[PDB]
Amino acid sequence: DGPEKNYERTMAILQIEAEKAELRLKELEVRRLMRARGDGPWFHYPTIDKELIDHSPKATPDN
Amino acid sequence: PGIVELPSLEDLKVQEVKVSSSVLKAAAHHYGAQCDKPNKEFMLCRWEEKDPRRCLE
Known part of the structure; x- marks a missing residue:
């Protein structure tokens, strides 16, 4: 493979991995807030149905 | 918590119907026909307000 193909294929890998790494960190923040405040779809524990x-x-x- | 508002003992004096249960039983059927209007208004007040203090009159 030429240096350009490997170079620009590497950037494609880095972009995909960087995007995932950011979403991994945001998820831990969303989970922390949802569990602390209970104002989201997660950690929503049932209450008696009116x-x-x-x-x-x-x-x-x-x- | 606030103070429970209560009517005065003079807000509750009325001429009572001092007859026994067998007397009311005997007159009940005619009583229900003749005195329906104030009776049904009181019970409408009674199931709407859900408060005996609101239907004293």
Whole structure:
């Protein structure tokens, strides 16, 4: 292989590896914030579904 | 937490219906027909407010 093919193939590898390395670091930051604040799709633990609640008038009034 | 607002003892004085349960049972059917209007308004207030202090009148 000529020096140019190896040279410019190397840059293609470096760009791919650098992009992945950046995304790896961002993911650890997103995971840290999502777990600390619980305001994202991850670390979202279920809560009772409000649609299980009965809203019709009950036998007694005060409720 | 705040103080629970309560009506005064004078806000609760009314002439009570001092008859026994067998008397009410006997008159119940005619009572339900004749006194439906104020009775149903009170129970509407009662299931809407969900608070006995809001339906005293």
